[PDB]
Amino acid sequence: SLEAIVQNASSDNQGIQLSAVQAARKLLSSDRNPPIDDLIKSGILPILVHCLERDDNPSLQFEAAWALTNIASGTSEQTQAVVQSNAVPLFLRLLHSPHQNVCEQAVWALGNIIGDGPQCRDYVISLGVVKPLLSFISPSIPITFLRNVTWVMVNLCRHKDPPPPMETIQEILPALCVLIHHTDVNILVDTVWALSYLTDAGNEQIQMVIDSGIVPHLVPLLSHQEVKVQTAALRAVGNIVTGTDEQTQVVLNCDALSHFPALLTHPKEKINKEAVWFLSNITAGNQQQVQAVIDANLVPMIIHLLDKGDFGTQKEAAWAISNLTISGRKDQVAYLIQQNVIPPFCNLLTVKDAQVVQVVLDGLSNILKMAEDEAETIGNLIEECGGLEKIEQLQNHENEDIYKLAYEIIDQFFSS
């Protein structure tokens, strides 16, 4: 029973301890629904944390660290019970144990604690976890241990309020440089996900990622054989291209766009959608970035998905089209018109997502304002496909911005 285990664990004799703590560990590691609450409510936690101090019995340290790892794998309440027992400084001690299993288990437990949230992340950081954690990365490290290390690194990079300290990012990025040249799939996936959490942290974090030189190593993973690596890399570079034009251009300079035909035609709708999201952040850029998308032969594929993709992909393709009109030249917009953008663009005017309707109206407005002489041609194209009637109907839409813009488009371009 738990009473028995607690009584045996609190002895001053390390053999009785070891016996009881192994029993608790077994309770916590034998299935996927462990009795965490019952072991917390038994009072065992400060006992396990004390066991962590016993450098004379490494087996005891290991069993207690495993038990605490699994307790800290549960909810925030359970992780926090572990944190409030003072486990963190002792786990950081055990990062220097001569015993490999104790060391790895300590890394694991700290992973769960850091994962609970940004203030736990920053407490563990402030006590100096990063330098000893990165000191494990070596040619000789066992691969399972290295995978746990890079998972912990994912957790050090994630959470955003606040994002990790600048100094920590500076310390982690060289480790990510090393690890992104790895061939193990889980290491790559976790490395790229850590980078993607960093590039979502702010434009200054993006700049740090860029300044590390790692982007040219990240872009070619969009064609990795493993779809998990592909999608992680798409997230990482996509977050970069949410930044400034210069930051986006760093990515474009690596020939990113050549990897997208295979993503726009991927069987998985979610990958089509994510790829179009990326490209819509490209076409929101300057004239040269719009031209890069054109030159890469991606516009017909975008328009095809605007017409025949799942609705999620279609929404993203609408953004791609409309964003192109922010800074795109008259000739670039004309190329869109030649590629038959108008009918599938207009088909979206009737959906219940008011955001998409606004996006498409904004795009049609910019297109008409841009096509000085051709505005009559384009207007007739809009009329042909039924778009004009849909604008007329949107004059009755609930949303002021939408029906305002519909009135204005009709008055400015369909009232001659």
Binding site: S29, G115, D116, V359
Partner: peptide, 24 residues
Amino acid sequence: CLGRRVVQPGMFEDHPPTKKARVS
């Protein structure tokens, strides 16, 4: 408003876990 957009809900949902138990 037109322009760049952050990663959208429903994207990249196969993320690494924040926590793992060690099961035998």
